[model samples]
Target: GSHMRGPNPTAASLEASAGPFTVRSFTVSRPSGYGAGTVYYPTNAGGTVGAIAIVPGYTARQSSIKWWGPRLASHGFVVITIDTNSTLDQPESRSSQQMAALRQVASLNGTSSSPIYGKVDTARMGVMGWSMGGGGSLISAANNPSLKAAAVQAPWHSSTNFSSVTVPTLIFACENDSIAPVNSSALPIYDSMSRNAKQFLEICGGSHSCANTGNSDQALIGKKGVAWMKRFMDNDTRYSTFACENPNSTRVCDFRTANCSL
Candidate 1:
C-alpha cells in the first residue's frame, strides 16, 4: 500500500525539487491541544509517509518558520508548521505544543473524512524548530524516545543537558549569532547528545535565523535536513551519503557527526 519504499530518488534529488508527487496543503484551526497551523504533504506519495512537526522561536509566529512546510513536504513527508498559543512561551511549552500537533496528525490519519487519512506513518515522526523552539525540539526528542529525528536552527536552551536523548539530531549553528552563540548554545547541546546519530553544521558568518525564513543557504540546509530525516525517520539508507557526507564550503563549515552509518 506504500509507494515510498526507498533506495530510489535520494534525498539530494528530493530536496532539489518537490519530487515526483504534487503537493497540497490546508489550515487547521484549534487542533485539539495545539494552536492553529498549516499541514503540507505530497498528493501521490503512493502511501503513508513520515511526518514532522515544527514550532517557531519565542516571540515568533508561524511565518518565521513556515517555509519548512513545502520544503519538506515536496520531498515526501507530512509537515505541520504551527503557531504557539502565546509567542512568548518557553521551550518546555513549545515542546508540549509540538507533540500535541504530532498527536493530532496521528488522529487525522485515522479519520476517514480527512485528506491525510492513511497518508501518514504516525509512528515515524520527527520534530524541528528555531531558537528556543529548537531547544524545545531537543527536549521533545528526549521526552519522546520514540521520535525518529530532530533538526534545529541556532537553538537557545536554558541548559545544555539533553544527554538522555537518543534520537538522531541535526543542529544548524550560525557562527555569528549574537543571540544564541554557537559556543554557548548549539555546541553545548550537540556535545551533550552522545548516544545517538548527530551532526552539526555551522553556517559561517550567519545570524540567529541562519537556517530559517529568508535564509540564503536554503539549498544546502534543505538538503541536509531532508537527508537526516529520511535516513533516520524512514530508515532510508540511500540518504546515508547525503546525511553523512560533510560539505565544507566558505558558506558552510564545521560539519561534524557521530555514530552515523549507511
Candidate 2:
C-alpha cells in the first residue's frame, strides 16, 4: 500500500521501545472543540500518515495518557492526546470531544501555518483512550463506522451493547481492574463487537493503570497497539502476525481475537 511507512517488521523491530520515525510535538495553541491538546507527529513518516485522538479517564489530565503521544507518533502517526473540557465529563461527552479533536487535526492539514499542515492523511483516522475515555473510544467507533480502527484500555461505560460498531477495535483489559472489572466491562464490550475485527488482551494481575503510562510492559503493549494501527490504518499486512498473533507473554492472563489473521 502507498500508505505503508517504515521498514518490514521483525520481533525485535516491533517490540522495541520506539519505531523508525523521528517525532516532534507542539501544543495546540488554540484547541478546537476539546479542552487542550498536544499533537505529536513524525518529521518524516515517509508518507501522509493516519491521525489518532487519545483521551484520558474521568478526573484525569493529559498527563495520564500523555505517554502515547511520542510512542504512536514515533511509529509513524499524527497523534493528538487530549484533555476533555471538563475533567468529570462522561463517556458520551468524551467520545464527542475525541472526534472533535480528530477533526481539528484534519483541519491542520490544510492550515498552511500549522506544523502538521499537509502532514496528515485526514481520511485515515483512529481513536484511543483510557478508562471512561476508553469507553468513549468505543462510542466514537460506534458513531463513526467509517473510522479506520479503535484501540482502548480498561474501558468503563454505563451501556454495553456496541454491536453496531464496524470499525476494527482492540481492547486492553486489566486483570485486576476493580474500577472497571473485566467480566462486566472490557470483556463484554469486546464480545459485543461481532461485526468487525476485534481483540481482547487481559494483562495478568494488572491494575487499571496497567496499559497506561508508567507501566512496565511497554515492549509488549506498545507492540500490540502499534501493530494494530499499522495493520488496519495503514493496511500494512506486514504487521499481521504481530497484530493478530498472541505473543503468549506471561504478563497477559487472557487473550482473545476474532476475524483476524496473519
Candidate 3:
C-alpha cells in the first residue's frame, strides 16, 4: 500500500493516452479453478494494488474485454481478462469463474516465485463483464459482499431481482442493443437494486458491445469505469467528481445514481 496517494490520474484526464505507471501483461494458463486469463498490472506502482476480474459474454473471448486490462492497470490496478471454460456458460457459471479468477490472483500474490508476488492487495477486489458475463458480475456482487465494486456493460440476466446486492455497481447500457434490450435487462436490473450504491449510464446509440469493441466512446466509458473502481474498490475519494458528476453529453441518453458517496 505504498503507492501514490491523492487524486487519481485517470479521473483527471479521461482521454489521456495512458496512466502514470508502466504496465506489464502476461498470460495465466489453466489457472487453478479457472480456464485461462491474461493479467495486467503496474510494474512500478511502488506497492500493492487492488485487483479486478473481467469476463466476456456468451460466445465471446478475452479479446472482447482485453482493452480494459491496460486501461485499468495503467491507472494502478491489477486487472485480469479471462476466458470461460465454455463459451456457452451462463451468467451463474460465469459469476463463479469470475470469482475463481480473482482467487487465482490472490493466490499469485503470495506466490514468491510469481512476478506479481507481494504486488496484489487481494483484500480489495472488483468484478466486471459484458452481456451475460455482465449479468454474472451482478450475481457475483450479490453473492459476494466482500467485493468492492461491480461494473457491467450491456448486461443480460434471466431475472431482474438483484435487490440483495450491497456492492457498489455501475451499469453501462447500450440504447440500441438488440440483443439484450435495455428496458428489460439493464434498466430493470438497475432499478431492482435499491439497497446499494448504483449508477446507470445509457449510451444514446450504442450496440451490445459499444463499451467494448472499437467504440468511439472509449474515453468516456474508460473514465467512468476507472473512476467507479477507484472510488469503491480503492476507496479513493478523489474520483468522487468523476464518478458522480454528470457528463452532460448528448450521447448519454440517461444517467442515474443513488446512495453514492465521495
Clashes of each: 0, 0, 0
For 1-262, candidate 1 gives per-residue lDDT tens digits of: 2224433755457557455567899898557666778999888776689999999998898888887888888778999999988889999999999999999998888989887989998889999999999999999999999999999999988999989999999999999999999998999999998899999999988988888877888878888888888788888777788888887678885778998985
| lDDT-sorted candidate list, best first | 2, 3, 1
> 162-234 in candidate 3: lDDT tens per residue?
9999999999999999999999899999999998999999999998999995688888898899888877887
lDDT of 2 by residue, 76-175 (tens): 9999999999999999999999999999999999999999999999989999999999999999999998799999999999987899989989999999
Looking at model 1, residue 127 earns an lDDT score of 97
What global local distance difference test value does model 1 have? Answer: 0.86
Question: Each model's TM-score, in the order given?
Answer: 0.95, 0.98, 0.95
> Best lDDT goes to which candidate?
2
Give the whole-model CA lDDT for all candidates, comma-separated. 0.86, 0.92, 0.88
Once superposed on the true structure, which residue ranges of model 3 sit more than 4 Å away at CA?
1-12
**Whole-model alpha-carbon lDDT for candidate 2:** 0.92
Evaluate model 1: give its TM-score.
0.95
Residue 41 lDDT, candidate 1, scale 0-100: 87
